[PDB]
Amino acid sequence: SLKDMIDSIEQFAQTQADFPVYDCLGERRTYGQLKRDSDSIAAFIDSLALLAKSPVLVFGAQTYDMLATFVALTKSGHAYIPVDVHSAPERILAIIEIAKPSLIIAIEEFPLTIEGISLVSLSEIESAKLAEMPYERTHSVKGDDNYYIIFTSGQPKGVQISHDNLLSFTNWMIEDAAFDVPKQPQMLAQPPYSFDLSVMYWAPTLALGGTLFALPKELVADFKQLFTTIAQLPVGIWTSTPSFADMAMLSDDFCQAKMPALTHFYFDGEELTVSTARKLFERFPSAKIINAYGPTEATVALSAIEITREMVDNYTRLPIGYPKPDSPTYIIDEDGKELSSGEQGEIIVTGPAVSKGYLNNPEKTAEAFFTFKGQPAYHTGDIGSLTEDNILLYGGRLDFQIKIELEDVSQQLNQSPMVASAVAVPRYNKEHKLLAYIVVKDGVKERFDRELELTKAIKASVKDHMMSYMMPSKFLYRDSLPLTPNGKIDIKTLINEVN
């Protein structure tokens, strides 16, 4: 049972000083270096005489200095706000208005000028590391103090995760049979620090003293090379969105033979498709696949389960798994009434992993955060249900249960032997409403004179399992789907594209 994230990495600094905590295509850093580097940055932070416990915005990609800096802020009692190098300047500016950081640490070149706030760059950090100052933790973040603030993706909200929030996620994850995390795990680090899925690699990794394998900023660009460089890393564990795995599927190198070391896939953030999973079993016969689910507002994930071939062969949708023992999760009616097994309603999460709320936004906190049986609770905005087995099943976003949930129509379509992926979207006219974007498997377009014949053909492929009222009317064909900065299918965009 983990007690303090920092205490942990501090031990590994005594216990396995020269073991690698970080690797970027071969340039490595060790637990001993992480301790000294972060001790010295901490010292530099304290010398800046920032207001106690103020948050600090850390802007960069996924280099070692990002992590060293995060650890230094935690040591010196500051929550960090991670902002990725690719985020839109308006997003950055909005984040800065909401969070009112006392300092900006631009570990990559800051793309803006913001007067009124202290700004420090990479050179200051490197100069602090080079100075090797000593550090004693007198005012680290502990308990209910913010550990990090992650901004959501509408208009942005700042989710406050406390050290206690964090420990509850991490302690579950490393004790969970599904995840089954090995000692000193060797984990890919593909998700950006601005997205909370990244916690799913750095927390268990730092807690179990493994190594993070990070990729350079410019490989994020070209996908042919990306997946070829990833291929060469001795990574044991792949953590990403399912859409990112779908992209990996287009590479010859994404397979057992080229990635002999790969034992586990951890997915969160997005519906894991039956088809994606089947395909993963094609390329990695021996790999285990873990589906996990949770909102940012409850620390990364609240449930998880192993995916089997039994499930892939049989099910329409994949399960999102067993809720964690310390975070009681409930399904509720629209009236607030808890539902018995099997009925569908809003997923509600409770317990010590629930965020204390949205930084400086009490209206939105009051709307989503409430007390359920005297336990702090969060409205997920997700529809699902609970099995007798205590297994969460996913229906979809409340925003998209349009009565059925668009998500269901979508997965019923993905069942077509002709469809690569589909998304059912509605058309609006006065705030008044059934279509679907389709990408077909390759070599399908060419088998067909016109769109109508293709549409009739697709619609016949799925008819015997699709209720009549759930079959959309017009299909809109594209060659791929738009992807959000965080590796997700951009549903919002697709619904706007059809006004």
55 assigned binding-site residue: no
Q: What residue type is 335 in one-letter code?
A: D
Q: Is 395 annotated as a binding residue?
A: yes
Cα separations in angstroms, 275 against 220, 432, 461: 25, 33, 16
488 is in an annotated binding site: yes
18 is in an annotated binding site: no
Question: Over the range 184-206, which residues count as b (16 or more CB within 10 Å of their CB) and which as e?
Answer: ebbbbbbbbbbbbbbbbbbbbbb
290 touches 176 (CB < 8 A):
no
Q: Are 147 and 163 in contact (CB under 8 A)?
A: yes
At residue 48's C-alpha, the angle toward residues 42 and 53, to 5°, is 70
Residue with tokens 């983990």: 2
Q: Largest Cα–Cα distance of the chain, in whole Å?
A: 73
Cβ atoms of 354 and 165 within 8 Å: the answer is: yes
The position carrying tokens 């976003």 is 397
Q: How far is CA 393 from CA 115, 388, 443, in A?
A: 48, 11, 34
* Residue 140: partners with Cβ closer than 8 Å, 6 or more residues away: 6, 74, 75, 76, 77
* Distance from C-alpha of 81 to C-alpha of 91, rounded to nearest angstrom: 13
Q: Which amino acid is at 230?
A: I
Fill in the amino acid letter for 222.
D
165 is in an annotated binding site: no
53: left (phi over 0), alpha (psi -120 to 50) or beta: left
Tell me: is residue 148 an annotated ligand-binding position. Answer: no
Query: 309 among the known binding-site residues?
Result: no
Report the alpha-carbon distance of residue 9 to residue 3 in Å, rounded. Answer: 12
The encoded tokens of residue 492 equal 């919002």
Distance of CA 366 to the CA centre of its chain: 24
- In the block, which residue shows the tokens 């000083």? 17
Residue 293 marked ligand-binding: yes
- Confirm whether residue 65 is marked as ligand binding: no
Burial class of residue 461 (count of CB atoms within 10 Å of its CB; 0-12, 13-18, 19+): middle
Q: Measure the N-to-C terminal CA separation of the chain; round to a whole number of Å.
A: 51
Residue 382 counted as an annotated binding residue: yes
Is 46 assigned to a binding site?
no
Residues belonging to the chain: 499
Which amino acid type is present at position 155?
Q
Tokens for 119, please give them. 């700004």
Q: Which amino acid is located at 329 in the chain?
A: T
Interatomic CA distance for residues 308 and 274, integer angstroms? 11
- Complete edge-to-edge strand list for the sheet that includes strand 118-121: 118-121, 103-106, 56-60, 80-84, 146-151, 158-162
Residue 142 is labelled as binding a ligand:
no
Q: Which domains does the chain have, with CATH numbers?
A: 1-397 (3.40.50.12780), 398-499 (3.30.300.30)
CA 422/CA 290 separation, integer angstroms:
23
CB atoms within 10 A of CB 123: 9
- On whether the CB atoms of residues 349 and 294 are closer than 8 A, the answer is yes
294 in a known ligand binding site? yes
Per-residue HEC secondary structure of the chain comes to CCCCHHHHHHHHHHHCCCCEEEEECCEEEEHHHHHHHHHHHHHHHHHCCCCCCCCEEEEECCCHHHHHHHHHHHHCCCCEEEEECCCCHHHHHHHHHHCCCCEEEECCCCCCCCCCCEEEEHHHHHHHHHHCCCCCCCCCCCCCCEEEEEECCCCCCEEEEEHHHHHHHHHHHHHCCCCCCCCCCEEECCCCCCCHHHHHHHHHHHHCCCEEEECCCCCCCCHHHHHHHHHHCCCCEEEECHHHHHHHHCCCCCCCCCCCCCCEEEECCCCCCHHHHHHHHHHCCCCEEEEEECCHHHCCCCEEEEECHHHHHHCCCCEEEEECCCCCEEEECCCCCECCCCCCEEEEEECCCCCCCECCCHHHHHHHEEEECCEEEEEEEEEEEECCCCCEEEEEEHHHECCCEHHHHHHHHHCCCCEEEEEEECCCCCCCCCEEEEEECCCCHHHCCCHHHHHHHHHHHCHHHCCHHHCCCEEEECCCCCECCCCCECHHHHHHHCC
Residue 295 assigned ligand-binding role = yes
